[PDB]
Design a protein around this ligand. Structure first.
Ligand SMILES: O=C1c2ccccc2C2=C(c3nc4ccncc4[nH]3)CCCN12
Length: 207
């Protein structure tokens, strides 16, 4: 396990998301589903030039998996996945520029719900989660686990968990008062409101 320090801008955004009083927390799910949809569009588009890009799995889908025992909500997609370089370097660049633009927009009067317009919607996961684990597999790299409970650091390690084939899993270790996001009726409600036109099958798993 390697440990890395978040740069100042992203660290400030994470504290803002964790600390600001904002009741409309449900938007995290729309953001993660839009991210999944964008990752699936990416592998699908690449597959048009190279069909072998789907040798790692032909199915293009999004699964929403709640687990009341573990208090987790997992968003699984079979999209492009992320390499080690994406996790550590490339997305660090995006977190910095995206946070700076979002922070400026917020000062002007924009809402926390507009986060996805700044390419950092992934960080809305901290509205409901005390810890976020990202398990990912890109065709050109190994399976990795990125993890952060904020506090200024994140970790990256090669993942020894169940082999995924290709894609990303965002595991949300929910805050104690955010367990409504494990309830079937609640997830179904959010998906219908914000994600009804996503061009991939969204399967809401039950327990
Ligand atoms: O989906 C997104 C995403 C979307 C937008 C921005 C960053 C991320 C992002 C990650 C990330 N933020 C970082 C911050 C600093 N240095 C390395 C970093 N890597 C890793 C997990 C997935 N992720």
């Amino acid at each position: 396990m390697e440990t890395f320090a978040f740069q100042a801008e992203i660290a400030q955004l994470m504290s803002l998301i964790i600390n600001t009083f904002y009741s409309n927390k449900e938007i995290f799910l729309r953001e993660l589903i839009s991210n999944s949809s964008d990752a699936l569009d990416k592998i699908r588009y690449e597959s048009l030039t190279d069909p072998s890009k789907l040798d790692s799995g032909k199915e293009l889908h999004i699964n929403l998996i709640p687990n009341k025992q573990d208090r987790t909500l997992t968003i699984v997609d079979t999209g492009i996945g992320m390499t080690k370089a994406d996790l550590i370097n490339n997305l660090g660049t995006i977190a910095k520029s995206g946070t700076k633009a979002f922070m400026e927009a917020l000062q002007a009067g924009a809402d926390i719900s507009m986060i996805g317009q700044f390419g950092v919607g992934f960080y809305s996961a901290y509205l409901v989660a005390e810890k976020v684990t990202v398990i990912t597999k890109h065709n050109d790299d190994e399976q990795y686990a990125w993890e952060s409970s904020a506090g200024g650091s994140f970790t990256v390690r090669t993942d020894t968990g169940e082999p995924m084939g290709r894609g990303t899993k965002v595991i949300l270790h929910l805050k104690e008062d955010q367990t409504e996001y494990l309830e079937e009726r609640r997830i179904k409600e959010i998906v219908k409101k914000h994600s009804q036109f996503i061009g991939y099958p969204i399967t809401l798993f039950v327990e």
